[PDB]
Amino acid sequence: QVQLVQSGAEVKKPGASVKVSCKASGYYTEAYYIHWVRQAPGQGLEWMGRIDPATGNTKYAPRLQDRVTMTRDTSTSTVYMELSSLRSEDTAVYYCASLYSLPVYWGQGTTVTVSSASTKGPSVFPLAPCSSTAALGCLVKDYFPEPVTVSWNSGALTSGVHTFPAVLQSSGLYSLSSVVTVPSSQTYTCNVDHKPSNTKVDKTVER
Amino acid sequence: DVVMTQSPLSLPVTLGQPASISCKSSQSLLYSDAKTYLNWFQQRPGQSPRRLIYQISRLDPGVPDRFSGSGSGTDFTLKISRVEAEDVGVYYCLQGTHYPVLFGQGTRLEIKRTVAAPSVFIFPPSDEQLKSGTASVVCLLNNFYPREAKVQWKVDNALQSGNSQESVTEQDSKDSTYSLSSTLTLSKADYEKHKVYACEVTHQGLSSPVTKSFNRGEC
Amino acid sequence: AIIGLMVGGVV
C-alpha cells in the first residue's frame, strides 16, 4: 500500500517554469510508476507522462514533450515534474497517480495558476433589487488567486443558496457572485474568506 | 497515434434509467498476453478522479455493482444499470496498451428532468462600487433546465458584446436544475451617461425572451 | 512482493 503527497499551490508568471513534487511512502515505492495527469478548467483529463522510479526512465505526452521533464530522487522517494514556458492554458489541477496499480494511488492535487497578477483580497458588494420570491446576494470582486469560500449567516442559511464559479477578468483578477432566494415574508450576511491574503469579510445585505 | 473516441459527449439520463458510454480505439488494445488494458475513470464535481474499472470488465474496490464493462479489441462500453444522482459527472476511458497513454475526451453525465424556464433577476451596481471607478451590473437566471441559456445585455437599446462574462452552477442534486450569473462591466463615466439597463434572456422553456430592467436614477 | 501492480497498463 502506497501514499502520495504533493507540493502545495503555486502561482507563476507567463513564460516561467513550475516544479511540482510527489513524495511516495509505503513498502516498495520503487515498484510503482508515477504518472502525472492534469485537469484545466472545464477541460478534460490530459495525461502528461510517467516516470519509472526504479531507473528514472520517462515517457511523455507528445503535445508536451518539448516543455515538461520528469525526475526522481531515490533517497527521498520523491518524483518531480517541471513544466516550462508556462502559458495561461496551463492553469490547472495537476495530480500524480500510480495509474497502473490496483488500486490506483492518487496524490491530493496541486493547483497551478499562470498569471502576472499579485495577491489581492476581495471587495464585497451587495446585490439588491432596485424595488412572492425575492433574491439578494454578494458580489465578491477583484481577488487573486483563487479560491474564495462563501457562506451565509455563518452557515445556518443553506437552502436556496447558489455560489457561482469564479470568472477571470481582463485585469487578471477573479470575480464571483453568491445569491440567495428569500421570502418577502429579516437579515442576511454573506461571509467571505480569502486565505491567500488572510482576508475575511462579513457583508450584510438589506431588502 | 492511437486515437480514442468516446461517445456521446453529453449524456442526460432520467433518474433510475440505465445508460451506456461507448469508447472506440483506432487499433486493438489487446497486448502480447491475453490482456486488454482498457480502463474507465470517473470524476464527480469537486472530487478527485477515480478508477471504476480495469481490464475491460473488472471492478475496482469501492465500485458498486451498478457499473459494468464490456467489449474487446477496439470497441468498449461502460454500462450503469440504474442511474442515481451520485453518478453525475464526467467519465473517461483510458488506454494503457500503446504508447502514449491516452484519455478519451470525456462524457458528461447529468440527470434529465422536464424543461424548466429560468427566473430572471437584475441588480444595479452598488453605490459603494460606484464610489471606486467601476460599475458591475448582474443578471441572475435561477433554477432552469436544460443548461443552455442566452443572456443579451442592452443599454438604452444598444446590444452589448465583449463586456460581459458569465458562470454556471453544477446541477442541483435536489431538483436537477442549474443557475446562471452574468456580469456586465462598465466604467463609471459610461454607466452614468445612460438611462435604461436591461438583460434579455432566451431559453428552451420560454415561449419568448424575458427581459428585466431598471432605470439608473430611479434606484 | 506486490499483487496487482500493473493491471492498468504496460506503457
Tab-separated table of C-alpha atoms in Angstrom:
chain	number	residue	atom	x	y	z
A	1	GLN	CA	0.000	0.000	0.000
A	2	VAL	CA	1.405	3.387	-1.125
A	3	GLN	CA	0.647	7.020	-0.242
A	4	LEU	CA	1.467	10.031	-2.422
A	5	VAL	CA	1.852	13.561	-1.103
A	6	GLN	CA	2.193	16.519	-3.429
A	7	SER	CA	3.568	20.010	-3.051
A	8	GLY	CA	1.209	22.906	-2.461
A	9	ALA	CA	-0.464	25.564	-4.569
A	10	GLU	CA	1.789	27.544	-6.904
A	11	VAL	CA	1.380	30.913	-8.630
A	12	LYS	CA	3.725	31.591	-11.578
A	13	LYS	CA	4.100	34.170	-14.335
A	14	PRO	CA	3.752	33.553	-18.089
A	15	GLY	CA	6.986	32.252	-19.652
A	16	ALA	CA	8.280	30.924	-16.333
A	17	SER	CA	8.684	27.347	-15.091
A	18	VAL	CA	6.923	25.387	-12.289
A	19	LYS	CA	8.165	22.289	-10.375
A	20	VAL	CA	5.660	20.068	-8.545
A	21	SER	CA	6.780	17.237	-6.264
A	22	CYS	CA	5.168	13.895	-5.291
A	23	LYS	CA	6.519	12.200	-2.152
A	24	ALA	CA	5.940	8.440	-2.148
A	25	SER	CA	5.845	6.321	1.026
A	26	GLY	CA	4.994	2.708	1.836
A	27	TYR	CA	6.537	-0.669	1.078
A	28	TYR	CA	8.482	-0.782	-2.221
A	29	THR	CA	7.792	2.728	-3.507
A	30	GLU	CA	10.296	1.974	-6.386
A	31	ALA	CA	7.909	-0.627	-7.924
A	32	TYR	CA	5.165	1.920	-8.766
A	33	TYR	CA	5.373	4.043	-11.883
A	34	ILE	CA	4.245	7.570	-11.044
A	35	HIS	CA	2.102	9.342	-13.640
A	36	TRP	CA	1.071	12.990	-13.915
A	37	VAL	CA	-2.313	13.967	-15.066
A	38	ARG	CA	-3.905	17.389	-15.301
A	39	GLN	CA	-7.328	18.982	-15.477
A	40	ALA	CA	-7.720	22.504	-16.750
A	41	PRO	CA	-10.948	24.473	-16.004
A	42	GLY	CA	-13.844	22.972	-17.965
A	43	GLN	CA	-11.335	20.723	-19.797
A	44	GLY	CA	-10.866	17.004	-19.962
A	45	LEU	CA	-8.226	14.982	-18.178
A	46	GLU	CA	-4.921	15.009	-20.017
A	47	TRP	CA	-2.123	12.513	-19.447
A	48	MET	CA	1.274	14.257	-19.241
A	49	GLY	CA	3.699	11.333	-18.867
A	50	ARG	CA	5.113	8.694	-16.438
A	51	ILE	CA	8.439	8.149	-14.675
A	52	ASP	CA	9.787	4.720	-13.550
A	53	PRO	CA	11.351	5.442	-10.157
A	54	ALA	CA	13.461	2.281	-10.456
A	55	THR	CA	15.525	3.580	-13.415
A	56	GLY	CA	14.371	7.185	-13.943
A	57	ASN	CA	13.078	6.345	-17.435
A	58	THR	CA	10.336	8.621	-18.697
A	59	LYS	CA	7.647	8.753	-21.386
A	60	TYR	CA	5.843	11.997	-22.254
A	61	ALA	CA	2.626	13.002	-23.970
A	62	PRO	CA	3.851	14.243	-27.385
A	63	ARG	CA	1.992	17.543	-27.195
A	64	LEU	CA	4.079	18.426	-24.119
A	65	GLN	CA	7.440	16.623	-24.654
A	66	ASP	CA	9.356	19.769	-25.595
A	67	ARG	CA	8.190	21.529	-22.375
A	68	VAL	CA	7.986	19.017	-19.489
A	69	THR	CA	10.583	16.991	-17.555
A	70	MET	CA	10.124	14.196	-15.021
A	71	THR	CA	12.823	13.476	-12.480
A	72	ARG	CA	13.251	11.266	-9.408
A	73	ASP	CA	15.206	11.318	-6.095
A	74	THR	CA	15.677	7.781	-4.779
A	75	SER	CA	16.999	8.755	-1.301
A	76	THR	CA	13.827	10.793	-0.657
A	77	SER	CA	11.410	8.603	-2.785
A	78	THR	CA	10.189	11.787	-4.396
A	79	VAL	CA	9.345	12.434	-8.071
A	80	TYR	CA	9.247	15.843	-9.693
A	81	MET	CA	7.521	17.358	-12.685
A	82	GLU	CA	8.672	20.606	-14.300
A	83	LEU	CA	6.531	22.462	-16.838
A	84	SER	CA	8.410	25.187	-18.702
A	85	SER	CA	7.290	28.093	-20.859
A	86	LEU	CA	4.044	28.426	-18.967
A	87	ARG	CA	1.021	29.916	-20.715
A	88	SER	CA	-2.393	30.609	-19.190
A	89	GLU	CA	-3.923	27.361	-20.553
A	90	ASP	CA	-1.516	25.564	-18.163
A	91	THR	CA	-3.549	26.931	-15.195
A	92	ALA	CA	-4.994	23.663	-13.845
A	93	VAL	CA	-5.062	20.963	-11.168
A	94	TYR	CA	-2.115	18.509	-11.544
A	95	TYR	CA	-2.288	15.042	-9.977
A	96	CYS	CA	0.380	12.359	-9.569
A	97	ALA	CA	-1.001	8.822	-9.603
A	98	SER	CA	0.129	5.207	-9.865
A	99	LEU	CA	-2.283	4.608	-12.787
A	100	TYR	CA	-1.009	1.068	-13.429
A	101	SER	CA	-1.591	-0.331	-9.903
A	102	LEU	CA	-4.532	-1.992	-8.109
A	103	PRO	CA	-5.999	0.259	-6.716
A	104	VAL	CA	-4.681	3.466	-8.173
A	105	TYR	CA	-2.997	5.585	-5.543
A	106	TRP	CA	-3.524	9.338	-6.048
A	107	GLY	CA	-1.879	12.447	-4.830
A	108	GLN	CA	-4.227	15.068	-3.472
A	109	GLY	CA	-3.735	17.538	-6.349
A	110	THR	CA	-1.720	20.682	-6.732
A	111	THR	CA	-3.188	23.835	-8.263
A	112	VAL	CA	-1.096	25.860	-10.654
A	113	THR	CA	-2.112	29.363	-11.735
A	114	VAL	CA	-0.319	31.114	-14.638
A	115	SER	CA	-0.679	34.888	-14.275
A	116	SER	CA	1.103	38.198	-13.712
A	117	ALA	CA	-1.350	39.326	-11.051
A	118	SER	CA	-0.246	39.835	-7.480
A	119	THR	CA	-2.176	38.695	-4.397
A	120	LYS	CA	-5.191	40.866	-3.588
A	121	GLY	CA	-8.073	40.238	-1.143
A	122	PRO	CA	-11.620	40.901	-2.428
A	123	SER	CA	-14.033	43.816	-2.208
A	124	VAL	CA	-17.563	42.593	-1.342
A	125	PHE	CA	-20.653	44.473	-2.656
A	126	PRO	CA	-24.374	43.827	-2.116
A	127	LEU	CA	-26.673	42.559	-4.802
A	128	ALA	CA	-30.125	44.025	-4.119
A	129	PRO	CA	-33.112	44.635	-6.358
A	130	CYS	CA	-33.994	48.171	-7.356
A	131	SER	CA	-37.528	47.942	-5.749
A	132	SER	CA	-43.524	36.242	-3.784
A	133	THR	CA	-39.882	35.096	-4.030
A	134	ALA	CA	-37.111	37.720	-3.737
A	135	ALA	CA	-33.394	37.398	-4.341
A	136	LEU	CA	-30.354	39.103	-2.929
A	137	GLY	CA	-26.660	38.462	-2.889
A	138	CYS	CA	-22.977	39.297	-2.767
A	139	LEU	CA	-20.528	40.343	-5.418
A	140	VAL	CA	-17.052	39.233	-4.412
A	141	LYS	CA	-14.895	41.207	-6.783
A	142	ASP	CA	-11.186	41.609	-7.761
A	143	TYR	CA	-9.333	38.929	-5.848
A	144	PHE	CA	-6.346	36.788	-6.687
A	145	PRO	CA	-5.600	33.934	-6.628
A	146	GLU	CA	-8.452	31.500	-6.108
A	147	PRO	CA	-10.088	30.153	-4.047
A	148	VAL	CA	-12.594	32.210	-2.069
A	149	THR	CA	-15.158	30.393	0.160
A	150	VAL	CA	-18.608	31.909	0.748
A	151	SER	CA	-21.353	31.146	3.264
A	152	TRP	CA	-24.465	32.848	4.594
A	153	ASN	CA	-25.356	33.582	8.201
A	154	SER	CA	-22.302	31.712	9.415
A	155	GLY	CA	-23.609	28.512	7.847
A	156	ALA	CA	-27.125	28.473	9.245
A	157	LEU	CA	-28.501	29.507	5.835
A	158	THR	CA	-28.046	26.899	3.096
A	159	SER	CA	-31.456	26.455	1.382
A	160	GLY	CA	-31.736	28.381	-1.902
A	161	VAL	CA	-28.063	29.402	-1.901
A	162	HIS	CA	-26.064	29.419	-5.101
A	163	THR	CA	-22.380	30.276	-5.146
A	164	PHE	CA	-21.097	30.556	-8.714
A	165	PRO	CA	-17.706	29.606	-10.194
A	166	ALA	CA	-15.259	32.479	-10.379
A	167	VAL	CA	-14.698	34.244	-13.696
A	168	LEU	CA	-11.304	35.635	-14.643
A	169	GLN	CA	-11.471	39.281	-15.646
A	170	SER	CA	-9.434	41.179	-18.259
A	171	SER	CA	-7.498	42.581	-15.294
A	172	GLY	CA	-6.323	39.105	-14.255
A	173	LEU	CA	-8.394	39.309	-11.107
A	174	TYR	CA	-11.239	36.898	-10.405
A	175	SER	CA	-14.850	37.615	-9.511
A	176	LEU	CA	-17.833	35.628	-8.269
A	177	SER	CA	-21.349	36.071	-7.068
A	178	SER	CA	-23.307	34.310	-4.377
A	179	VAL	CA	-27.042	34.621	-4.291
A	180	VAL	CA	-29.861	33.536	-2.087
A	181	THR	CA	-33.609	33.249	-2.526
A	182	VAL	CA	-35.632	34.512	0.378
A	183	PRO	CA	-39.326	35.262	1.012
A	184	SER	CA	-40.531	38.885	1.395
A	185	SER	CA	-42.479	37.174	4.269
A	186	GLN	CA	-35.032	39.951	8.016
A	187	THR	CA	-31.162	39.822	7.901
A	188	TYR	CA	-28.659	38.117	5.595
A	189	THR	CA	-24.923	38.268	5.856
A	190	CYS	CA	-22.542	36.673	3.423
A	191	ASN	CA	-19.241	35.508	4.936
A	192	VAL	CA	-16.323	35.624	2.597
A	193	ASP	CA	-12.900	34.180	3.336
A	194	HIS	CA	-9.781	34.529	1.160
A	195	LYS	CA	-6.910	32.768	2.828
A	196	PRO	CA	-4.172	33.693	0.418
A	197	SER	CA	-4.446	37.340	1.600
A	198	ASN	CA	-5.775	36.420	5.051
A	199	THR	CA	-8.873	38.478	4.325
A	200	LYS	CA	-12.297	37.911	5.809
A	201	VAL	CA	-15.390	39.999	5.153
A	202	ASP	CA	-18.903	39.792	6.580
A	203	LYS	CA	-21.303	41.764	4.438
A	204	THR	CA	-24.883	42.400	5.469
A	205	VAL	CA	-27.330	42.970	2.635
A	206	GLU	CA	-30.767	44.590	3.007
A	207	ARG	CA	-34.284	44.301	1.476
B	1	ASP	CA	-1.017	7.678	-32.752
B	2	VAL	CA	-3.680	5.508	-31.236
B	3	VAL	CA	-6.837	7.657	-31.090
B	4	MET	CA	-9.664	7.214	-28.538
B	5	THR	CA	-13.196	8.261	-29.494
B	6	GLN	CA	-15.684	8.450	-26.622
B	7	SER	CA	-19.413	8.689	-27.330
B	8	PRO	CA	-21.672	10.626	-26.713
B	9	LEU	CA	-20.028	13.743	-25.255
B	10	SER	CA	-23.099	14.645	-23.152
B	11	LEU	CA	-25.480	12.114	-21.594
B	12	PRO	CA	-28.689	13.369	-19.923
B	13	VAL	CA	-30.389	10.444	-18.163
B	14	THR	CA	-33.775	10.231	-16.435
B	15	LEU	CA	-33.353	9.217	-12.829
B	16	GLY	CA	-33.450	5.433	-12.487
B	17	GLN	CA	-32.815	4.678	-16.175
B	18	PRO	CA	-29.858	2.663	-17.429
B	19	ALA	CA	-27.161	4.345	-19.521
B	20	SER	CA	-24.147	3.339	-21.645
B	21	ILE	CA	-20.998	5.132	-22.829
B	22	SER	CA	-19.025	3.961	-25.879
B	23	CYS	CA	-15.241	4.118	-26.358
B	24	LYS	CA	-13.598	3.119	-29.672
B	25	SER	CA	-9.859	2.939	-30.324
B	26	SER	CA	-8.144	3.271	-33.715
B	27	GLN	CA	-6.343	-0.034	-33.055
B	28	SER	CA	-6.725	-3.020	-30.765
B	29	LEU	CA	-5.767	-2.733	-27.136
B	30	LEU	CA	-5.002	-6.448	-26.844
B	31	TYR	CA	-1.357	-6.755	-25.690
B	32	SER	CA	1.088	-9.729	-26.031
B	33	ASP	CA	-0.557	-11.523	-23.043
B	34	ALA	CA	-4.261	-12.303	-23.435
B	35	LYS	CA	-4.707	-8.962	-21.516
B	36	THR	CA	-6.505	-5.783	-22.711
B	37	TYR	CA	-5.664	-2.577	-20.827
B	38	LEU	CA	-8.867	-0.612	-21.269
B	39	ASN	CA	-9.833	1.277	-18.100
B	40	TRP	CA	-12.774	3.501	-17.175
B	41	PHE	CA	-12.458	6.526	-14.870
B	42	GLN	CA	-14.979	8.863	-13.256
B	43	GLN	CA	-14.686	12.369	-11.891
B	44	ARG	CA	-17.562	13.802	-9.913
B	45	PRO	CA	-17.809	17.582	-9.352
B	46	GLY	CA	-15.357	18.888	-6.733
B	47	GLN	CA	-13.666	15.458	-6.282
B	48	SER	CA	-10.525	13.695	-7.444
B	49	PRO	CA	-10.882	11.222	-10.299
B	50	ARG	CA	-11.153	7.510	-9.518
B	51	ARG	CA	-10.871	4.322	-11.460
B	52	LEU	CA	-14.125	2.412	-11.846
B	53	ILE	CA	-12.940	-0.483	-13.936
B	54	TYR	CA	-9.647	-2.080	-15.150
B	55	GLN	CA	-9.073	-4.651	-17.945
B	56	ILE	CA	-12.455	-4.021	-19.698
B	57	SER	CA	-14.786	-5.529	-17.154
B	58	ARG	CA	-13.022	-5.783	-13.725
B	59	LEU	CA	-14.400	-3.568	-10.949
B	60	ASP	CA	-12.053	-1.661	-8.702
B	61	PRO	CA	-12.724	-1.905	-4.969
B	62	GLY	CA	-15.350	0.516	-3.701
B	63	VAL	CA	-17.225	0.468	-7.024
B	64	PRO	CA	-20.886	-0.531	-6.811
B	65	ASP	CA	-22.339	-3.404	-8.855
B	66	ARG	CA	-24.306	-0.865	-10.984
B	67	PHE	CA	-21.222	-0.283	-13.126
B	68	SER	CA	-20.196	-2.991	-15.613
B	69	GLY	CA	-17.866	-3.118	-18.613
B	70	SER	CA	-17.673	-4.930	-21.878
B	71	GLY	CA	-16.142	-5.186	-25.316
B	72	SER	CA	-12.883	-6.349	-26.877
B	73	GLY	CA	-10.138	-5.307	-29.291
B	74	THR	CA	-11.175	-1.825	-30.434
B	75	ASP	CA	-14.758	-1.472	-29.112
B	76	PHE	CA	-15.840	-0.821	-25.475
B	77	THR	CA	-18.911	0.014	-23.470
B	78	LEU	CA	-19.457	1.234	-19.928
B	79	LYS	CA	-22.944	0.355	-18.575
B	80	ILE	CA	-24.677	1.773	-15.476
B	81	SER	CA	-27.699	-0.393	-14.799
B	82	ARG	CA	-29.609	2.211	-12.794
B	83	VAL	CA	-28.577	5.880	-12.627
B	84	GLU	CA	-28.618	7.773	-9.306
B	85	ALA	CA	-27.825	11.394	-8.559
B	86	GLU	CA	-24.364	10.262	-7.276
B	87	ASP	CA	-23.484	9.208	-10.818
B	88	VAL	CA	-23.475	12.812	-12.090
B	89	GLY	CA	-20.074	13.710	-13.531
B	90	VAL	CA	-17.561	13.050	-16.276
B	91	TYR	CA	-16.468	9.580	-17.414
B	92	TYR	CA	-13.235	8.843	-19.288
B	93	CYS	CA	-11.721	5.795	-20.945
B	94	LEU	CA	-8.029	5.255	-20.688
B	95	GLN	CA	-5.965	3.061	-22.906
B	96	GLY	CA	-2.837	1.611	-21.269
B	97	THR	CA	-1.548	-0.715	-24.024
B	98	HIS	CA	0.242	1.507	-26.595
B	99	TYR	CA	2.441	4.493	-26.094
B	100	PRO	CA	1.228	7.130	-25.348
B	101	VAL	CA	-1.271	6.577	-22.570
B	102	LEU	CA	-4.372	8.463	-23.560
B	103	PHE	CA	-7.698	9.550	-22.046
B	104	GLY	CA	-10.857	9.777	-24.114
B	105	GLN	CA	-12.416	13.245	-24.383
B	106	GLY	CA	-14.904	12.566	-21.603
B	107	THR	CA	-18.681	12.052	-21.391
B	108	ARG	CA	-20.608	14.384	-19.185
B	109	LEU	CA	-23.476	12.638	-17.393
B	110	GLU	CA	-26.314	14.669	-15.988
B	111	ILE	CA	-29.828	13.962	-14.745
B	112	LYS	CA	-32.666	14.739	-17.089
B	113	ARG	CA	-35.864	16.370	-15.845
B	114	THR	CA	-38.653	18.259	-17.601
B	115	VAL	CA	-37.796	21.620	-19.148
B	116	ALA	CA	-37.932	24.434	-16.604
B	117	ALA	CA	-37.688	28.109	-17.559
B	118	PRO	CA	-35.356	30.344	-15.566
B	119	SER	CA	-36.461	33.110	-13.168
B	120	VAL	CA	-34.594	36.327	-14.046
B	121	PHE	CA	-33.340	38.975	-11.658
B	122	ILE	CA	-31.350	42.140	-12.436
B	123	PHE	CA	-29.139	44.019	-9.907
B	124	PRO	CA	-27.848	47.501	-10.388
B	125	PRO	CA	-24.355	48.369	-9.185
B	126	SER	CA	-23.912	49.202	-5.518
B	127	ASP	CA	-23.306	52.886	-4.777
B	128	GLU	CA	-20.240	51.543	-2.915
B	129	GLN	CA	-18.743	50.114	-6.120
B	130	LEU	CA	-19.578	53.328	-7.911
B	131	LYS	CA	-17.501	55.258	-5.370
B	132	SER	CA	-14.434	53.500	-6.819
B	133	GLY	CA	-14.481	53.859	-10.659
B	134	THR	CA	-16.340	50.756	-11.938
B	135	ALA	CA	-19.966	49.703	-12.348
B	136	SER	CA	-20.807	45.950	-12.375
B	137	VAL	CA	-24.374	45.083	-13.304
B	138	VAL	CA	-25.550	41.497	-12.629
B	139	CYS	CA	-28.310	39.290	-14.175
B	140	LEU	CA	-29.386	36.078	-12.386
B	141	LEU	CA	-31.069	33.152	-14.105
B	142	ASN	CA	-32.355	30.886	-11.435
B	143	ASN	CA	-33.329	27.171	-11.313
B	144	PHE	CA	-33.619	26.231	-15.000
B	145	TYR	CA	-33.142	23.195	-17.260
B	146	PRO	CA	-31.536	22.342	-19.630
B	147	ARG	CA	-28.161	24.052	-19.127
B	148	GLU	CA	-28.106	26.125	-22.332
B	149	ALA	CA	-29.287	29.730	-21.995
B	150	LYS	CA	-28.545	33.031	-23.630
B	151	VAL	CA	-28.291	36.391	-21.951
B	152	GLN	CA	-28.334	39.565	-24.050
B	153	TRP	CA	-27.349	42.845	-22.440
B	154	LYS	CA	-28.872	46.147	-23.729
B	155	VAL	CA	-28.007	49.728	-22.593
B	156	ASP	CA	-30.525	52.293	-23.888
B	157	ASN	CA	-31.289	49.660	-26.527
B	158	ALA	CA	-27.684	49.215	-27.739
B	159	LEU	CA	-26.805	45.463	-27.741
B	160	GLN	CA	-23.624	44.838	-25.713
B	161	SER	CA	-20.889	42.423	-26.637
B	162	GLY	CA	-17.383	41.668	-25.422
B	163	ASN	CA	-18.003	43.228	-21.984
B	164	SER	CA	-19.870	40.569	-20.134
B	165	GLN	CA	-18.823	37.314	-18.582
B	166	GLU	CA	-20.879	34.528	-17.156
B	167	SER	CA	-20.784	31.498	-14.955
B	168	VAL	CA	-22.983	28.393	-14.330
B	169	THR	CA	-23.557	26.158	-11.294
B	170	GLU	CA	-23.175	22.410	-11.133
B	171	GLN	CA	-26.512	20.600	-11.302
B	172	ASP	CA	-28.521	20.709	-8.101
B	173	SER	CA	-28.927	17.174	-6.700
B	174	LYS	CA	-32.397	18.026	-5.318
B	175	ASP	CA	-34.300	19.455	-8.317
B	176	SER	CA	-31.698	18.787	-11.059
B	177	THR	CA	-31.666	22.483	-12.089
B	178	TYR	CA	-28.886	24.967	-12.994
B	179	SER	CA	-28.469	28.624	-12.280
B	180	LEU	CA	-26.511	31.247	-14.137
B	181	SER	CA	-24.995	34.602	-13.423
B	182	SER	CA	-23.855	37.171	-15.915
B	183	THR	CA	-21.994	40.388	-15.107
B	184	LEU	CA	-21.806	43.431	-17.416
B	185	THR	CA	-18.811	45.668	-16.601
B	186	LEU	CA	-18.703	49.394	-17.457
B	187	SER	CA	-16.586	52.331	-16.403
B	188	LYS	CA	-18.412	54.679	-14.009
B	189	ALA	CA	-18.385	57.506	-16.611
B	190	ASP	CA	-20.105	55.257	-19.141
B	191	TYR	CA	-22.524	53.901	-16.570
B	192	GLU	CA	-23.581	57.485	-15.744
B	193	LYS	CA	-24.236	58.513	-19.378
B	194	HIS	CA	-27.135	56.052	-19.922
B	195	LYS	CA	-30.623	55.510	-18.530
B	196	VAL	CA	-32.160	52.032	-19.123
B	197	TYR	CA	-30.221	48.816	-18.325
B	198	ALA	CA	-31.737	45.512	-19.472
B	199	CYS	CA	-30.920	41.828	-19.646
B	200	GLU	CA	-32.858	39.789	-22.230
B	201	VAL	CA	-32.971	36.020	-21.608
B	202	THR	CA	-33.608	33.274	-24.160
B	203	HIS	CA	-34.253	29.605	-23.148
B	204	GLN	CA	-35.952	26.453	-24.367
B	205	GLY	CA	-38.668	26.745	-21.626
B	206	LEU	CA	-39.693	30.305	-22.556
B	207	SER	CA	-42.119	30.998	-25.418
B	208	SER	CA	-40.476	34.380	-25.696
B	209	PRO	CA	-37.490	36.274	-24.383
B	210	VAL	CA	-37.912	37.534	-20.848
B	211	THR	CA	-36.464	40.952	-20.114
B	212	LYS	CA	-35.721	42.635	-16.778
B	213	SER	CA	-34.569	46.168	-16.467
B	214	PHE	CA	-34.054	49.182	-14.252
B	215	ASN	CA	-33.578	52.916	-14.782
B	216	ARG	CA	-30.431	54.401	-13.339
B	217	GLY	CA	-31.563	57.439	-11.334
B	218	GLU	CA	-34.808	55.798	-10.202
B	219	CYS	CA	-32.867	53.462	-7.903
C	1	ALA	CA	6.088	-8.861	-3.338
C	2	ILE	CA	3.339	-6.674	-4.889
C	3	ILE	CA	-0.024	-8.066	-6.115
C	4	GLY	CA	-1.898	-6.276	-8.930
C	5	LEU	CA	0.926	-3.786	-9.582
C	6	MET	CA	0.352	-3.461	-13.353
C	7	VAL	CA	-3.329	-4.121	-14.068
C	8	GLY	CA	-3.978	-0.625	-15.518
C	9	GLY	CA	-1.264	-0.709	-18.223
C	10	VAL	CA	2.195	-1.634	-19.537
C	11	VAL	CA	3.398	1.553	-21.347
